[PDB]
Amino acid sequence: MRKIIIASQNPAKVNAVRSAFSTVFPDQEWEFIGVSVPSEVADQPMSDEETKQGALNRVRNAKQRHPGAEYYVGLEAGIEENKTFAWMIVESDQQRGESRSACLMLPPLVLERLRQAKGDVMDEIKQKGGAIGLLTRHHLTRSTVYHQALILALIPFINPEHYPS
Amino acid sequence: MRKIIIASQNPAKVNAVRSAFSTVFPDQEWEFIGVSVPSEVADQPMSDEETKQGALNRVRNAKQRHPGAEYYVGLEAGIEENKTFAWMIVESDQQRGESRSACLMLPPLVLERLLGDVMDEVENIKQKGGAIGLLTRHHLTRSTVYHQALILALIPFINPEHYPS
Numbered sequence: 643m644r645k646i647i648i649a650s651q652n653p654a655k656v657n658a659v660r661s662a663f664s665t666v667f668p669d670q671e672w673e674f675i676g677v678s679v680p681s682e683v684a685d686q687p688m689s690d691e692e693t694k695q696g697a698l699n700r701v702r703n704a705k706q707r708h709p710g711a712e713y714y715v716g717l718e719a720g721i722e723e724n725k726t727f728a729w730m731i732v733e734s735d736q737q738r739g740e741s742r743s744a745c746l747m748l749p750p751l752v753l754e755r756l757r758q759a760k761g762d763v764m765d766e767i768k769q770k771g772g773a774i775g776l777l778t779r780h781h782l783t784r785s786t787v788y789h790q791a792l793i794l795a796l797i798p799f800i801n802p803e804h805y806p807s
Numbered sequence: 808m809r810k811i812i813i814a815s816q817n818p819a820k821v822n823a824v825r826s827a828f829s830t831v832f833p834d835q836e837w838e839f840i841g842v843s844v845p846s847e848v849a850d851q852p853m854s855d856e857e858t859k860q861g862a863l864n865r866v867r868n869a870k871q872r873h874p875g876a877e878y879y880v881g882l883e884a885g886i887e888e889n890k891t892f893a894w895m896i897v898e899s900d901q902q903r904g905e906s907r908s909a910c911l912m913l914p915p916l917v918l919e920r921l922l923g924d925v926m927d928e929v930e931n932i933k934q935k936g937g938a939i940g941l942l943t944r945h946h947l948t949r950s951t952v953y954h955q956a957l958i959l960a961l962i963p964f965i966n967p968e969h970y971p972s
């Protein structure tokens with residue numbers, strides 16, 4: 643039974659990957675393993691480029707630390723200016739998939755006291771759908787937003803005939 | 808009854824705006840009207856920045872073309888390199904909400920040609936969730952993807968206290 647390495651030990655992230663893979667590949671089974679590896683970037687990325695690079699670095703570190711898995715998944719949240727979002731990276735041995743989730747405007751008060759490297763600042767939460775869930779009256783949750791990005795990041799693997807190398 | 812102007816006459820886009828507002832506001836009541844205004848940018852935006860500008864322009868023009876509405880919404884798709892996405896902009900008479908949908912990787916064969924009607928090849932299977940719907944085996948559709956971005960764009964209007972003018 644092939645396994646999938648998640649560049650994170652957060653149960654929430656591992657579950658989302660589980661849900662995304664079970665949704666897209668319901669006819670297959672894998673062992674999802676959440677590993678802990680450095681991103682080699684700020685614990686709190688302050689740019690789109692840095693957020694994506696951090697996800698990419700974790701995936702490379704994951705491959706090096708736990709070789710042999712069929713898929714490696716990186717999931718990194720970050721912010722740019724007044725927006726927040728997360729980068730999704732899925733890598734097989736030969737191909738790579740990626741997608742950035744929809745971005746959201748954070749409150750100015752939360753933003754100002756976040757540049758100070760403070761997250762938990764969201765107290766004026768990681769159980770009611772996160773910042774997204776709170777800000778959207780739960781019409782969206784971090785899980786349902788990440789789910790879409792994860793599925794999008796799998797496109798290359800879903801349509802091999804259209805995405806070579 | 809109040810009214811909401813959608814900077815597009817596309818029934819698909821008008822529908823999404825309706826569903827978004829009906830979801831965030833289960834009650835209330837307003838009339839959605841699809842209007843046709845120019846974006847003033849390339850018919851097919853080629854950068855994230857240009858795509859956002861096109862959405863902002865249509866909204867601004869819609870405000871001058873049809874004043875009086877309580878909400879004005881711009882929904883502009885675009886691409887950059889090998890990624891596609893859409894910008895959502897919602898404007899009232901005091902503030903602006905915005906969000907860019909999760910992005911998706913287009914097949915290299917698609918980026919080659921480009922004219923997002925190349926997708927009409929490998930024909931109207933396209934109205935089966937659009938490219939998104941076809942590429943994700945309908946596990947996602949352009950509509951369900953646009954729906955999340957639209958809700959996120961409504962954040963400022965959902966949290967007036969945390970989002971001033």
Ligand SMILES: [Mg+2]
Nearest residue numbers: 682699702703
């Ligand atoms: Mg490394």
Ligand SMILES: [Mg+2]
Nearest residue numbers: 779780781782
């Ligand atoms: Mg809910």
Ligand SMILES: [Mg+2]
Nearest residue numbers: 944945946947
């Ligand atoms: Mg479906």
